[PDB]
Structure 1
Amino acid sequence: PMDDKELIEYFKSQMKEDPDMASAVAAIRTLLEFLKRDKGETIQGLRANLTSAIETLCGVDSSVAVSSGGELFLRFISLASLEYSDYSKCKKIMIERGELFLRRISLSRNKIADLCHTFIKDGATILTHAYSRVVLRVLEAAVAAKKRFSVYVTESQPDLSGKKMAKALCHLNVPVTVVLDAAVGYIMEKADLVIVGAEGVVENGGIINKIGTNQMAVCAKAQNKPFYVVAESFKFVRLFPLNQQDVPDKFKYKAEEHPWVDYTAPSLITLLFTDLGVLTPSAVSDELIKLYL
């Protein structure tokens, strides 16, 4: 069994060896590998060990996606334990189901890109917040379809990931522009639609994202511009922030008051683009309900 050093080292190595890998995917793979090497025979003990490893996996890379992946993994093992009832029989089936689950979630970026690239028109002006690989893949798919468009991206001041995405997008010969986080209200009137990533989809259909997303959502609503969000299926989490203060503090801080995360209400979101398809925000809760019945 892993001893809090093999687990963290495995997580960091998984992230480092594949820099194009989501944090939640790396966490799920680490949990599956931990389940492979257990050397114990009890479903209760396995659940306890997994849920205890969740905290030490969330100690580093405290993003919401890791917690969502851990909750999804716990629900997965509970679902398997319902069906079989012998830890010995259930172990192999959980291992194989985790293998298929990893293979399925590895294609989420491609599915989202294929489903979403049709919403970008010729001559459109996309507005993006920060660096996200899903939006990058969507724009790559749009370019592969011979569409021509412009892109504005904010600098994301706390860590200049906006410039990183601008570089990664100029690498594809896409005409892009970099704007300040305070220039969003100046730029919204030029853009035709807004595409942002998500670090987690909350129960009501809102999103949890980098600190500058709420301003862009509010400005787009004021200017009546569509606001599209791309997020993977494993980012669904049963949390309901009543407001900005209500989101748990373990997601705001640790990568005078510099939160790293804010919450966007579902009323400001037009459509969610997931590997499950194109959804209204109200759909998300439905899915997140069907999992827990």
Structure 2
Amino acid sequence: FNITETYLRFLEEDTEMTMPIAAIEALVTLLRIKTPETAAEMINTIKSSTEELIKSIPNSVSLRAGCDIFMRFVLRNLHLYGDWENCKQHLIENGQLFVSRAKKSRNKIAEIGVDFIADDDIILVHGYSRAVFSLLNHAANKFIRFRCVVTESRPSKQGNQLYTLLEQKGIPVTLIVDSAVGAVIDKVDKVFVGAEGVAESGGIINLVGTYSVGVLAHNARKPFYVVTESHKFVRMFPLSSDDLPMAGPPLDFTRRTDDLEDALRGPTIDYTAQEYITALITDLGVLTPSAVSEELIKMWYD
């Protein structure tokens, strides 16, 4: 039946439902076919499937986070000690239900937690997340004199795409280079971030250039923020300042080649420390200070 196939199914469209939610839905669909009453035929198979998915990954992180969350939910479910049928039914219901919830969470984020750009506080943004864009688009109907600043995105010109999404709302924008990132920290108020995950350490698992940005923010004391829908607390620890579960090579010193070939293995993923989140915007209340870690503890009861 496959989760991989389901994942493939959505690509051209998307741009609405959270990825981690689609994956969860797929998992649920996979489950509700082969009898979810028994725990011997099922949980192990689910785990195997997850492993397979992990193996098959090109360059995607949050899947694991999603699946572990799902597992946790499942575990939580069968503590009521009543019967096998009702609980199973509830579990089955809770896949589509979870997907439905994501939209509500997004709504909550974009109507309560959008008071971080109000007094024309110019926004230096990097990391394309849906939530960040959703909040920005929802704040365009209030006309609170907002202004956008874009540091260029170069995995393969996502920057262009981003600038094309801000042209539908009609708002003055500007191209920024991440070498002249020391140059302009002046008129721009704060630095806001989209990402790929939040760590057990606290810091952010992100993209093509982030640690430098963080450093600069620290230097300037103009606060550094991360904005997302909350379900990216993967069981991972970046213990070093140049280590994570990485898809590509970590700085591959290529051999003495000839005609401009092996070069562009430029780090498309980077991370900065725990003493960098001035605030983190999440749908489970606006909570940050040691919140992720607390949540993890609550989950694993340790």
Whether TM-score is above 0.5 comes out as yes
Which of the two has higher C-alpha Rg? 2
User: For the aligned residues, what is the CA RMSD?
Assistant: 2.2
Q: Which residue of 1 aligns with 2:14?
A: 18
Aligned to 2:31: 35
User: Which of 278, 285, 291 is 2:286 aligned to?
Assistant: 278
Q: Take 2:40 and 2:173, find their aligned partners in 1: how far apart are those partners?
A: 53
SS in 2 for 1:166: helix
Deviation of residue 251 (structure 1)? 7.7
Q: 1:217–1:269: 8 Å Cα contact kept in structure 2? A: no
Mapped pair 1:7 → 2:3: yes
**Quick one: distance in 2 between partners of 1:107 and 1:247?**
32
Structure 1: stretches of 5+ with no match in the other structure: none
Q: Does the Cα contact within 8 Å between 2:22 and 2:99 map onto a contact in 1?
A: no
Q: Which residue of 2 aligns with 1:200?
A: 197
Aligned partner of 2:298 in structure 1 is 290
2:233 maps to what in 1?
A: 236
* Matched letter for residue 42 of structure 1: T
Residues 167-182 of structure 1: pairs in structure 2 closer than 5 A: 167-182=164-179
Q: Letter of the aligned partner of 1:222 in structure 2?
A: N
d(CA) in 2 for partners of 1:87, 1:199: 37
Larger helix fraction of residues = 1
Aligned to 1:9, the other structure's residue is in SS state helix
Which deviates more from structure 2 when the two are superposed, residues 34-43 or residues 228-237? 34-43
What is the letter of the counterpart of residue 187 of structure 2? K
Question: What is the distance in 2 between the residues matched to 1:291 and 1:64?
Answer: 19
The aligned counterpart of 2:258 is: none
- 3-state SS, counterpart of residue 70 of structure 1: helix
Aligned partner of 2:185 in structure 1 is: 188
Matching residue's letter, 2:171: V
Q: Normalising to structure 1: TM-score of the pair? A: 0.89
The residue identity in structure 2 corresponding to 1:55 is E
Match of 1:163 in 2: 160
Tell me the SS of whatever aligns to 1:184: coil
Moved more, 159-168 or 237-246: 237-246
For residues 36-51 of structure 1, the aligned pairs below 5 Å read 36-39=32-35, 41-51=37-47
Give runs of aligned pairs for residues 47-58 of structure 1, distance below 5 A: 47-58=43-54
TM-score scaled by length of structure 2: 0.86
CA shift for structure 1 position 289:
1.1
Residues 239/252 of structure 1: CA separation in 2 closer, same or farther (3 Å cut) = farther
8 Å contact kept, 1:151–1:176: yes
Matching residue within 76, 81, 101 for 2:78: 81
Letter in 1 for 2:241: Q
Distance in 2, matches of 1:86 and 1:216, equals: 53
Q: Which residue of 2 aligns with 1:226?
A: 223
Which shows bigger deviation, 14-23 or 66-75?
A: 14-23
Distance in 2 separating the partners of 1:134 and 1:67: 20
Q: CA deviation at 1:230?
A: 0.7
CA–CA distance in structure 2, aligned partners of residues 119 and 34 of structure 1: 41
Instruction: Assess if the C-alpha contact under 8 Å between 1:205 and 1:281 holds in 2.
Output: no
Partner of 1:176, secondary structure, is: coil
